[PDB]
Symmetry: D2
Subunit: 156 residues, 4 copies
Amino acid sequence: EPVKDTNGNPLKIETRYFIQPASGGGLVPANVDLSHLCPLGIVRTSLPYQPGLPVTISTPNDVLTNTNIAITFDAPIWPCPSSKTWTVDSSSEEKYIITGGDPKSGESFFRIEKYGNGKNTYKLVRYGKSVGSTKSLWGPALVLNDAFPIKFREVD
Amino acid sequence: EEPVKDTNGNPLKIETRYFIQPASGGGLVPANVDLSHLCPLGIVRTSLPYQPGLPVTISTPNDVLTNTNIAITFDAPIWPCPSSKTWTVDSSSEEKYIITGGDPKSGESFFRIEKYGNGKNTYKLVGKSVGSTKSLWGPALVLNDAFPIKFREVD
Amino acid sequence: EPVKDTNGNPLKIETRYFIQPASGGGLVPANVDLSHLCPLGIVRTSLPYQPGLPVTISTPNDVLTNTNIAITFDAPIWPCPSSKTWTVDSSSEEKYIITGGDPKSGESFFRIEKYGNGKNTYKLVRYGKSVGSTKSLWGPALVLNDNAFPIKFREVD
Amino acid sequence: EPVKDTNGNPLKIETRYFIQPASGGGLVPANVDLSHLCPLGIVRTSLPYQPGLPVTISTPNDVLTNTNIAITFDAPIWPCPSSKTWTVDSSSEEKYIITGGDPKSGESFFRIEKYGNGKNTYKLVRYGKSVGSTKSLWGPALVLNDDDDSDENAFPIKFREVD
Ligand code: CLA
Ligand code: CLA
Ligand code: CLA
Ligand code: CLA
């Protein structure tokens, strides 16, 4: 079934959305620790009115639940030599969700699933392993569990 | 001596949060002016399109009126500099950067909101107006010898 | 008695020294945590051949043990609106040794004392409260104890 | 002929050296501008007594002049997903010397040549295009000159052994 935004409208591919915590402000690029600059991790900003860095969703025009999708940050500047596409830091113990994935490759595929109670609330799951958060340098950072509830706000 | 209006045409209120958005990239934010100064912070225009800016509250020494002494203070849950979030002029610098750390009750921190050019709800900060200069992180607010702004209410 | 450098020579005021851990490289400015940029703390660099940021010692020309001295970083550029003089962050729980002190004021007075093993090895003590270290953002940061952080003074050639 | 260090001793491969400006302190990693974090550029530190970040030299045990060598930073921490080996940023207009090269590949080969009068003073040349410097974010950054291999805009260097 269709993934809905905060206005209850269906999510469209190639459309800009803030991924906002459903449970501070939105989700943003920040480095995971002082040992890694690139690629970047995804942290919840502690600043109350910051909407997040927008993302576009792509499918290998509706975004449906339980289907393979790829999340890519939308930014006019990017200081890392790799992509803005979310992926899993396989090497790390923490299993941080990091940038630099290939949006056409399976290493970058997540699934948007419904999350408990409230409407328009979702979780990211990787194939069942869900995306959660861990305390890190800049605040809560997205990690692959062995769930971090999110909403999608349309960028007006 | 008429009311300053926000982007919705509503009058500005003191002790209310507003994004100061360029009228002319996203809103106005704290960033350091160059690699020689960390504190206090300057005010730069973010190059990221949907960043609203760091909110400010306006205070008067409840309406904010044009051509009256006001003080602009950043609203932030964290502040890593040992001084205030109140805008003021970096007197020492050649560039005359608008910097944080002013005293909101003191005259060193008084600006006046004046009408700018054509469009409604467009203003400037002032007979020396606030403009911008190229700096480290992008356009930084400076005192001229005008940088047009709108006030968006933080909903 | 005179404080000696790593060459066994007496320390002189207004002379540049690296304060090197006696126990990684020398002592350097870094911020203590992500909530404070200025003033700066003093951390031990984890990079093996970095000598530290040099300091000059001042007295309110010989530097003697158990006498009031003030430590001031020597740097051509300084991005904080305060001094390069070491002092104690009174407000913090950790009691970080921070920059921004007044070198003529008592808030900035430390005493160089002999430390245990080996010649030319010293500790900083504040009036007895000694200077130790704590884990912080960038690595071990100098703090005032209630574990003394042993130091040598290397002359800057 | 052998490249000599600041003590006049011949340079050895797999040995740590500070590359110090012959002409501020030594050469260090810093980003080139606010648009690039990785890979890193090479800047001259403006802090007088900072020796530089040490490098080891490798040859595809003596380091000789006018022979292909590769310069690799020696560092306990490295936050970029690529190597510590110097190479040329081909894409950039400035032609910054950047990290992330392959030390066994030709993209990373420099040649150490004599510079001017004074002994133990050298330049880096790429095959004749010499390494110079340009004003950048953190200070003078190493760049590849266009040059007919002269010492005019070449960035003169000494090698200090890390004791
Ligand atoms: C808020 C400002 C600030 C911050 C965050 C730092 C942070 C640091 N300083 Mg310091 N420093 C400052 C102000 C600051 N300093 C000032 C004003 C001076 C006088 C000019 C100095 C003089 C100084 C000296 C002489 C040295 C340091 C060193 C260090 C590092 C100690 C950690 C380490 O040994 O390995 C970690 C080191 C790495 C290089 C790994 C990279 C770490 C991650 C990816 C973050 C990138 C850091 C980046 C450059 C941030 C800008 C801060 C910059 C001043 C370093 C750390 C990067 C030591 C050092 O290591 O130099 C590089 C050192 O020798 N400092
Ligand atoms: C290495 C790269 C890097 C780093 C370190 C950061 C860091 C951060 N990003 Mg991000 N970001 C990046 C890349 C980076 N990002 C890229 C490439 C983009 C796309 C262009 C973004 C887009 C982005 C957006 C849209 C937002 C952030 C935000 C944040 C902040 C989240 C935590 C917070 O709530 O701060 C709140 C606290 C502060 C801002 C004060 C910080 C405390 C002091 C001043 C520390 C100063 C740094 C110190 C010297 C150490 C330097 C080390 C560093 C080199 C690792 C944090 C400052 C959010 C934010 O808060 O914006 C400011 C936010 O909305 N990011
Ligand atoms: C030393 C202190 C300091 C520094 C260096 C900065 C720097 C910056 N701030 Mg600010 N800020 C500060 C203090 C600081 N701020 C404080 C105390 C607050 C109140 C909490 C804020 C609140 C704030 C907000 C709300 C916003 C900023 C934004 C910005 C950016 C404006 C330029 C841009 O559009 O880049 C965009 C380009 C990038 C993010 C990628 C550049 C790659 C560089 C080379 C690496 C930079 C890493 C990291 C962001 C630097 C660490 C410093 C950190 C404090 C931000 C710039 C990165 C805007 C922003 O862009 O958010 C991130 C923004 O919306 N600031
Ligand atoms: C992106 C990563 C990064 C960045 C930005 C830097 C930047 C710098 N490095 Mg390097 N370095 C790195 C990675 C990095 N390095 C790595 C991975 C290593 C190996 C572990 C090193 C090893 C190294 C050594 C050994 C040395 C440096 C030094 C320097 C400085 C050279 C300019 C100078 O003389 O300042 C002098 C002036 C100051 C240090 C005071 C300026 C303080 C400013 C205001 C801090 C700015 C913070 C602000 C939030 C903006 C940050 C932007 C950032 C996000 C890009 C500069 C701060 C030299 C140095 O000077 O020591 C720190 C030095 O000796 N580097």
